[PDB]
Structures are given as structure tokens and as C-alpha cells.
Amino acid sequence: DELYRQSLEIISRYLREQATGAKDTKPMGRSGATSRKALETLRRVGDGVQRNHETAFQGMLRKLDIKNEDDVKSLSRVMIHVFSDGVTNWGRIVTLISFGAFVAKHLKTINQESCIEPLAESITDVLVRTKRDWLVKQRGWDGFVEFFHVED
Numbered sequence: 245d246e247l248y249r250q251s252l253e254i255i256s257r258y259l260r261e262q263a264t265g266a267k268d269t270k271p272m273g274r275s276g277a278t279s280r281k282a283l284e285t286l287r288r289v290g291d292g293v294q295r296n297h298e299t300a301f302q303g304m305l306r307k308l309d310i311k312n313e314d315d316v317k318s319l320s321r322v323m324i325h326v327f328s329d330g331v332t333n334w335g336r337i338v339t340l341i342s343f344g345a346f347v348a349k350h351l352k353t354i355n356q357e358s359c360i361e362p363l364a365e366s367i368t369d370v371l372v373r374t375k376r377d378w379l380v381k382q383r384g385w386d387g388f389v390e391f392f393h394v395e396d
């Protein structure tokens with residue numbers, strides 16, 4: 245189940261880096277080459293999504309009323325209902341993960357830093373349960389990186 249493992253690594257790191265403002269120094273794993281480039285991709289593409297859907301992200305966050313790990317537990321059920329509706333593409337997977345980072349910054353501001361792990365697990369779980377095969381078809385994270393690769 246390398247896919248759940250790679251995905252969690254990428255998503256947790258992006259969420260953590262986003263909440264704290266600080267890159268993590270610790271080495272990756274099996275395909276940390278891909279993992280790093282996928283993290284670098286999220287930095288550019290994930291950040292843009294946050295800038296452009298700031299209002300909807302704030303509105304979604306406020307309506308969700310997230311205060312603790314408990315409020316986080318219930319998040320995942322709303323997450324899957326919204327996400328598994330409509331069409332699959334890389335853009336919606338990035339919207340998913342980007343709102344995850346938006347929620348993670350909010351958690352940090354409210355002193356719920358440790359809600360960031362289960363949030364990441366919950367995002368990773370939703371994505372992999374509903375999109376595993378599409379992800380496989382796309383060459384998972386290498387495909388992610390290749391599809392979004394632009395000149396710096």
C-alpha cells in the first residue's frame with residue numbers, strides 16, 4: 245500500500261508546512277524524489293488555489309465550525325460527500341488538498357496543531373478510497389508532478 249503511504253507523506257507535509265510556515269527538514273521515503281517534487285508542486289499550485297478561492301474556503305471553514313479533534317472526526321464524512329460528487333481531475337484533487345491546508349492554518353491559529361495529523365490522514369483516506377484506480381491510471385504522484393510541471 246505504498247500509495248496511501250506516499251500520499252500521506254505528501255499531504256501531511258504540505259499541511260504542516262502551510263500551518264507553521266516552516267519547511268520540514270527530515271528525509272522522505274521510498275520515492276522522496278517524487279515526494280519532494282510533488283510537495284514543490286503543491287506549494288505553487290496549492291497556494292494559488294487558496295488565493296483564488298479564499299472566499300469560498302473561508303465560507304466553507306466558517307460553516308464547518310471546527311474547534312477540536314472531535315469536530316475534525318466528522319469533517320471526513322462531509323469531505324467525502326462533496327468530493328466524490330461530480331468529476332475527477334487533478335484540479336479537484338488539488339482543491340481538496342489546498343482546502344486541507346487552509347483548514348490546517350486555521351487549526352494552528354486556534355492552538356489545535358495536533359488536529360493536523362488526523363486531518364491529513366482523513367484527506368488521504370478520502371482521496372485513496374475514492375480515487376485509487378484513477379490515481380494508478382495517472383501514474384500517481386509522478387503523473388501529478390508531470391501534469392503540473394512548468395518552467396520556474
Ligand SMILES: Cc1cc(C(=O)NS(=O)(=O)c2ccc(N[C@H](CCN(C)C)CSc3ccccc3)c([N+](=O)[O-])c2)ccc1-c1cccc2c(CCCOc3cccc4ccccc34)c(C(=O)O)nn12
Binds near residue numbers: 300302303304
Ligand atoms: C471551491 C468552492 C467553491 C464554492 C462556491 O460555491 N463558490 S461560489 O458559488 O463562487 C460562491 C458562493 C457563495 C458566496 N458567498 C456567500 C453568500 C451567499 N449568499 C447568496 C447567500 C457567502 S461566503 C461563502 C459561504 C459558503 C460557501 C462559499 C462562500 C460566494 N461569494 O460571496 O463570493 C461565492 C463553494 C465551496 C468550494 C469549496 C470549498 C472547500 C473545499 C472544496 C472542494 C473540495 C472537496 C471538499 O473538500 C472538503 C470538504 C469538507 C471538509 C474538508 C476538509 C479538509 C479538506 C477538504 C474538505 C470543492 C470541490 O471539489 O468542488 N469545492 N470546495
